[PDB]
Design a protein around this ligand. Sequence first.
Ligand SMILES: [Mg+2]
Ligand SMILES: [Mg+2]
Ligand SMILES: [Mg+2]
Ligand SMILES: [Mg+2]
Ligand SMILES: [Mg+2]
Ligand SMILES: [Mg+2]
Ligand SMILES: [Mg+2]
Ligand SMILES: [Mg+2]
Ligand SMILES: [Mg+2]
Ligand SMILES: [Mg+2]
Ligand SMILES: [Mg+2]
Ligand SMILES: [Mg+2]
Ligand SMILES: [Mg+2]
Ligand SMILES: [Mg+2]
Ligand SMILES: [Mg+2]
Ligand SMILES: [Mg+2]
Ligand SMILES: [Mg+2]
Ligand SMILES: [Mg+2]
Ligand SMILES: [Mg+2]
Ligand SMILES: [Mg+2]
Ligand SMILES: [Mg+2]
Ligand SMILES: [Mg+2]
Ligand SMILES: [Mg+2]
Ligand SMILES: [Mg+2]
Ligand SMILES: [Mg+2]
Ligand SMILES: [Mg+2]
Ligand SMILES: [Mg+2]
Ligand SMILES: [Mg+2]
Ligand SMILES: [Mg+2]
Ligand SMILES: [Mg+2]
Ligand SMILES: [Mg+2]
Ligand SMILES: [Mg+2]
Ligand SMILES: [Mg+2]
Ligand SMILES: [Mg+2]
Ligand SMILES: [Mg+2]
Ligand SMILES: [Mg+2]
Lengths: 172, 386, 63, 103
Amino acid sequence: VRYAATPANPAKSASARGSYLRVSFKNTRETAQAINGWKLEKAQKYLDQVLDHQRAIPFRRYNSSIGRTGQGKEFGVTKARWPAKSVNFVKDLLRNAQANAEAKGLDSSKLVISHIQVNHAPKQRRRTYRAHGRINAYQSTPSHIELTLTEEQIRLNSRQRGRLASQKRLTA
Amino acid sequence: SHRKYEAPRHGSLGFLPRKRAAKQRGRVKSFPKDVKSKPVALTAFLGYKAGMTTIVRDLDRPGSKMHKREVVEAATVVDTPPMVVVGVVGYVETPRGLRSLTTVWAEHLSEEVRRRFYKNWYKSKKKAFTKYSGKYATDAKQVETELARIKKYASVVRVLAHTQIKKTPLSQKKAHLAEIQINGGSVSDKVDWAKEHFEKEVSVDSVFEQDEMIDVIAVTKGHGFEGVTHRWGTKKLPRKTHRGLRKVACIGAWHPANVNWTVARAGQNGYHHRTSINHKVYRVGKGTDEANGATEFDRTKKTINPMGGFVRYGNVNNDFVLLKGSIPGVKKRVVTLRKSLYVDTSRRAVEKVNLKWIDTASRFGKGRFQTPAEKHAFMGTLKKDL
Amino acid sequence: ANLRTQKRLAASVIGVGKRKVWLDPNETTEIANANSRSAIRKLYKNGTIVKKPETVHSRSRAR
Amino acid sequence: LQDVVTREYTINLHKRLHGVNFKKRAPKAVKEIKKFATLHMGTTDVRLDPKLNIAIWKRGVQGVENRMRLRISRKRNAKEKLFAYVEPVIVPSTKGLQTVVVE
RNA sequence: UAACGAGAUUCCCACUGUCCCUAUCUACUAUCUAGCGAAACCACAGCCAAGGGAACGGGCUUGGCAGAAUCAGCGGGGAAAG
RNA sequence: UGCUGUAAAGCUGGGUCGAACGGCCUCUAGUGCAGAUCUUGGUGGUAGUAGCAAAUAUUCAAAUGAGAACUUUGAAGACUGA
RNA sequence: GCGAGAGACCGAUAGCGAACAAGUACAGUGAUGGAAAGAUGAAAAGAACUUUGAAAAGAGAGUGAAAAAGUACGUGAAAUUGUUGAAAGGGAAGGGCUUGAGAUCAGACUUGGUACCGGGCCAG
Ligand SMILES: [Mg+2]
Ligand SMILES: [Mg+2]
Ligand SMILES: [Mg+2]
Ligand SMILES: [Mg+2]
Ligand SMILES: [Mg+2]
Ligand SMILES: [Mg+2]
Ligand SMILES: [Mg+2]
Ligand SMILES: [Mg+2]
Ligand SMILES: [Mg+2]
Ligand SMILES: [Mg+2]
Ligand SMILES: [Mg+2]
Ligand SMILES: [Mg+2]
Ligand SMILES: [Mg+2]
Ligand SMILES: [Mg+2]
Ligand SMILES: [Mg+2]
Ligand SMILES: [Mg+2]
Ligand SMILES: [Mg+2]
Ligand SMILES: [Mg+2]
Ligand SMILES: [Mg+2]
Ligand SMILES: [Mg+2]
Ligand SMILES: [Mg+2]
Ligand SMILES: [Mg+2]
Ligand SMILES: [Mg+2]
Ligand SMILES: [Mg+2]
Ligand SMILES: [Mg+2]
Ligand SMILES: [Mg+2]
Ligand SMILES: [Mg+2]
Ligand SMILES: [Mg+2]
Ligand SMILES: [Mg+2]
Ligand SMILES: [Mg+2]
Ligand SMILES: [Mg+2]
Ligand SMILES: [Mg+2]
Ligand SMILES: [Mg+2]
Ligand SMILES: [Mg+2]
Ligand SMILES: [Mg+2]
Ligand SMILES: [Mg+2]
């Protein structure tokens, strides 16, 4: 399998994947962007506080007509949520990549979430029933998630040279 | 087409936007115009709305059918412990308006006013005004220099005063700090008065006399989001109207193809800043007086407090102001009492009030006694009395 | 862990409704092993399964 | 500080149930009692004795008593080092009773 | 034309929030959260005033102006959708 | 990556890929798409939005389980009310 | 119908409706109506084993010419989308012309001839 981003030094990196996960893509994109570039331990503590509603995930792109909260002030937003299913899937993938780094001999206190991204997975179809005998779509929008933990002359003209030389001769 | 019939507009366009006040403390938009020949005096005071009561009064209004006859009147009690003067600000006249030049503070500020400058006082090192307090080191020439600057350049001098909210039954510990303009005398006179009043208490009886007409600055009672029917007093639609009736049926003509600012719309009601004028002072009571609620006709030794205390306020153990009628705000609200901005010589403004009696029955129910002694005299011994 | 069958069998063996069958909460393993009506009869006789008393409708006020 | 402790409290369930949906008054008395034990014992792990559940529900979904006398024990436990155990105290009247440490 | 009538109509008594003139209260919503998650519709899009113009402009011309990201409501406009 | 042609287009560098394909002289046609409320397939914005509100009502504990508002058992509170 | 040979025919939305368990699945009381759906690799060699995880899976490893072929299989366009990087942004954006800035590309010291002859481009 090919990751979207290859690590610069593969010997100091560990990766994890989750494909066809039946979790909301939009929520999972927001929770991945909330911990992109963080220390692994800091992000793990943060995701625990999100599950405990002590802190929130800022919703930045897929946030139309969602509620406002005071727990978004930390990130300079008003729209934030606490997506538990997405947080749990991301925590599972962080746990897996940390196990892979330990199996590589890397140090967990130095690990940083250097790469994480969410792609659309193929939809899962269902049916909903509508007024006047109509059928509509009731699809799921699943997620692919992947992540990587990384341990932390001048050439002058003839007259430009002439001016430079004559200026040196003025200064003795 | 024109309206079939004429009717006045619902509500006033002079109180827009109907939004929440930016602060809970009402701010004096305008102070009384300064007259140099008068003595140096404060123009406003801060108090707390305790509650309402009832009085009986002999009317002095010749030509009225109630002249020399008893009237029963609603009154408002404002708990007003003395304010402490802690600072002074100088203002300069500029082609762009008044501009604060300098603020000089007193050496010592009490904890209740220093809590004003904190959102998290309990987690703080409480460093406010410590270096400034050091500015008074053994000569205070920085302070004298700033005071001389105010004397030399300021045209409007305002004092900084805070309430002693620890003397009220409120659980809030932050004092309320406000600028009160000093009127009367020269600028130098005003600066000398402020300096000599640094860290001193100023009472209500030095700002307001009885029978005065004063204005009240306060933020009214909040009601949250409200529909047009009660926000603007519009007519309810018929009972059989689809999708509801507490609406305005037509919110505009086809053109202008926009909703106009003059149409009543649902939104936040109450909690507005209001300036209410011409409230007569029926009493400037004293906290040390044990007969606050007693008059010359009711000699019952009696405080202003009703039986069981003011509901959701407590007892008024301080100096107080008894105002005629109703003032904006709720109980416990900080209220700004301002002197009148004009000279009223009407009989309502110049009438001398002599109270007959002040109601001190319980406000927590249909109270029927003015005093526990009266209650015991009426009912006799109870089982709990043994 | 799922005594639904045992309660249905006990109701049929005792002859009462399922609402009157008491399965000993401290004997879950033994009841879970009672796969037959014979074993249900044995537990009923031992007191592991109890027929609960009828809820009283007194006729005293009517009388 | 002693981590293992038993005390008897009176809880005013009447003001905590003021205005509450009638079909939610006993469930909310359960939640108010849990929040009461967290307030006093400092533990978010609160366990209710089934005899306490019977006393709460004794008069139906809206028959919760005005005052209940509770015995609350902090005991060693997990993700929570301690827990609070609430069980009822049978008393003649629930009035005039102060908080008491049970030794 | 007695009787009958969820037939049409007028008057009277009783009655009342139909109204004067509104106010208050309950449950379920709406609201906020976890999970789940459609559809209509969609040239491009979306601030006004006047002008001219297929004679009623979001776009053109001339002006007024104009500061991220937004939430609950709302029914003026989109000569809104079907 | 560029070059050529007014243009329709032709050629070329790099990457990907894996079995056929082109220039020129002619022949032939089911031979060139932006539209047809076109056809079939696929995908958006809307949008984490509308919403998931009839039928009185659930609660405590134990068991099981990686995981229990929803499973099982016990205790209670209710309802259908022949 | 049975058996054969062919073509300037079509090349999986084409060619019969049907290249496949197609007159099938499925609908309709019924007469009838009636699809979609081909392609790993030469060969399953279809990933032993270790490790994290409740598991699905992941990470190592292994097979293979290739896993940028893993059965959700040749190639793998566009719409639409994530991440990284670059840039711009006061009630749309997009376009033409012109120049600046930044990036990319190109070219005469030529297939130059013998210190010199002479040449190329930009300018006075
Ligand atoms: Mg919202
Ligand atoms: Mg439906
Ligand atoms: Mg139907
Ligand atoms: Mg008119
Ligand atoms: Mg209201
Ligand atoms: Mg109707
Ligand atoms: Mg009262
Ligand atoms: Mg209520
Ligand atoms: Mg009939
Ligand atoms: Mg149009
Ligand atoms: Mg216009
Ligand atoms: Mg015109
Ligand atoms: Mg238009
Ligand atoms: Mg313009
Ligand atoms: Mg509406
Ligand atoms: Mg409209
Ligand atoms: Mg091949
Ligand atoms: Mg050829
Ligand atoms: Mg054709
Ligand atoms: Mg097309
Ligand atoms: Mg065309
Ligand atoms: Mg079309
Ligand atoms: Mg289509
Ligand atoms: Mg919603
Ligand atoms: Mg509904
Ligand atoms: Mg019943
Ligand atoms: Mg075909
Ligand atoms: Mg076909
Ligand atoms: Mg294929
Ligand atoms: Mg290959
Ligand atoms: Mg391949
Ligand atoms: Mg492929
Ligand atoms: Mg694309
Ligand atoms: Mg804007
Ligand atoms: Mg350019
Ligand atoms: Mg350039």
